[PDB]
Amino acid sequence: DISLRHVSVLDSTMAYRETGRSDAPVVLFLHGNPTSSYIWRNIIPLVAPVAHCIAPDLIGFGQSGKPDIDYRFFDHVRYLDAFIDKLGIESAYLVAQDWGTALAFHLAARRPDFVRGLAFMEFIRPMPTWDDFHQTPQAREMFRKFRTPGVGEQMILEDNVFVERVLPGSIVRKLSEEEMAVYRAPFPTPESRRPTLRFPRELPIAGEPADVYSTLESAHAALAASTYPKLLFTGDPGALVSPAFAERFAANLKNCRLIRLGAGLHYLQEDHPEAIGRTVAGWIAEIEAAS
Ligand SMILES: [Cl-]
Ligand SMILES: [Cl-]
């Protein structure tokens, strides 16, 4: 059974999904834009036998509160940090996708000993040019429009394009009507959609925004030097991560195994939950037995 809980955090509240035996290591699942802990619903039960699974809804997403903030990357850093402290988590495996990987990389860079292992996919990295972002002309044009004043507000705040187009368009299988009802539930109003507009405007592309760009460059330098166990999952063709890029990226990290899932785009949990869950569970069991 998965439980949906709430925990007071800073000036607001955060929801999180929880399951697993509490005497096992913690695994923290970190979603990105514009999902929530719901995207881990078919993975968490498969890791539950070996770990204490904790999957928060980032502030402003899912069933978490909606404080009056900018929802910058650095805001998410503060709320996630506060969430981890409030639950008393002193060390954890991290499982992450999209902006959840930026949060995971930055957490690991600040507290390297916190990470028991990092399983990541479809991750954010500093992108020196627009040619380094994604793979398709239509994605490049759309995210350029997100980052254009006025245009981005119309597409995302008024028309909810990140939830209604980018999310189902970046998954191979068809989402059910109920699944899309869940994913749009946090975002019924223009004002509620602010976090899904701020995130693409935070993506580190061509040096902007400079603070995120610098921060993720440092995070990736720490990642490259780190020696904790790592799993990089990839889809084909993928989206932010192509198979060929994943192969080189993992081969240039220390202690990183590459898992090729097959047909996938950006939100790989919706196309390969059992492969991801079973692989993570076996990887944790391996690492825990090795102690
Ligand atoms: Cl996600
Ligand atoms: Cl984004």
Yes or no: say if 227 and 112 are a contact pair by the CB < 8 Å rule. Answer: no
CA of 111 to the centre of ligand 2 (A): 25
Give the closest ligand to the alpha carbon of residue 167: 1
How many CB atoms within 10 Å of residue 71?
23
Name residue, tokens 């890791």: 47
CA of 181 to the centre of ligand 1 (A): 16
The helix-helix angle for 137-146 and 194-202 (nearest 10°) equals 110
Fold of domain 3-290: Rossmann fold (3.40.50)
- Residue 55: phi and psi, rounded to 5, are -130, 95
To the query of whether residue 122 is one of the catalytic residues in this protein, the response is yes
CA of 96 to the centre of ligand 1 (A): 7
* Cα–Cα nearest to 240, from 266, 258, 259, 216: 266
Give the closest ligand to the alpha carbon of residue 152: 2
Yes or no: say if 280 and 43 are a contact pair by the CB < 8 Å rule. Answer: yes
CA of 29 to the centre of ligand 1 (A): 9
The full DSSP string for 10-64 is TTEEEEEEEES-TTSPEEEEE--TT--GGGGTTTHHHHGGGSEEEEEPPTTSTTS
Triad 51, 46, 277: Cα angle to 5°: 100
To the query of whether residue 70 is one of the catalytic residues in this protein, the response is no
How many CB atoms within 10 Å of residue 287?
16
Structure tokens at 160: 């909810």
- According to DSSP, the residues that pair with 56 across neighbouring strands are 16
DSSP symbol at 217: H
Cα separation, 43 vs 38, whole angstroms: 10
Yes or no: say if 109 and 219 are a contact pair by the CB < 8 Å rule. Answer: yes
- State which amino acid sits at residue 91: S
CA of 291 to the centre of ligand 1 (A): 31
Annotated catalytic residue: which of 18, 57, 75, 122? 122
Yes or no: say if 14 and 81 are a contact pair by the CB < 8 Å rule. Answer: no
- State which amino acid sits at residue 83: F
* Cα–Cα nearest to 202, from 32, 79, 37: 32
Cα separation, 27 vs 284, whole angstroms: 9
Cα separation, 156 vs 146, whole angstroms: 8
Element (H, E) at 117: strand 115-123
Spans of all domains in the chain: 3-290
CA dihedral sign of residues 62, 67, 71, 75: negative
How distant, in Å, are the alpha carbons of 93, 141, 262, 277 from that of 46?
A: 15, 38, 20, 5
CA of 20 to the centre of ligand 2 (A): 30
Cα separation, 265 vs 18, whole angstroms: 27
CA of 196 to the centre of ligand 2 (A): 7
- According to DSSP, the residues that pair with 230 across neighbouring strands are 118, 256
Give the closest ligand to the alpha carbon of residue 40: 1
CA of 263 to the centre of ligand 1 (A): 17
Cα separation, 40 vs 100, whole angstroms: 12
Give the closest ligand to the alpha carbon of residue 97: 1
To the query of whether residue 98 is one of the catalytic residues in this protein, the response is yes
Cα separation, 273 vs 255, whole angstroms: 23
Yes or no: say if 99 and 124 are a contact pair by the CB < 8 Å rule. Answer: yes
Annotated catalytic residue: which of 18, 57, 75, 98? 98
CA dihedral sign of residues 46, 241, 107, 41: negative
Annotated catalytic residue: which of 76, 220, 266, 272? 266
Give the closest ligand to the alpha carbon of residue 203: 2
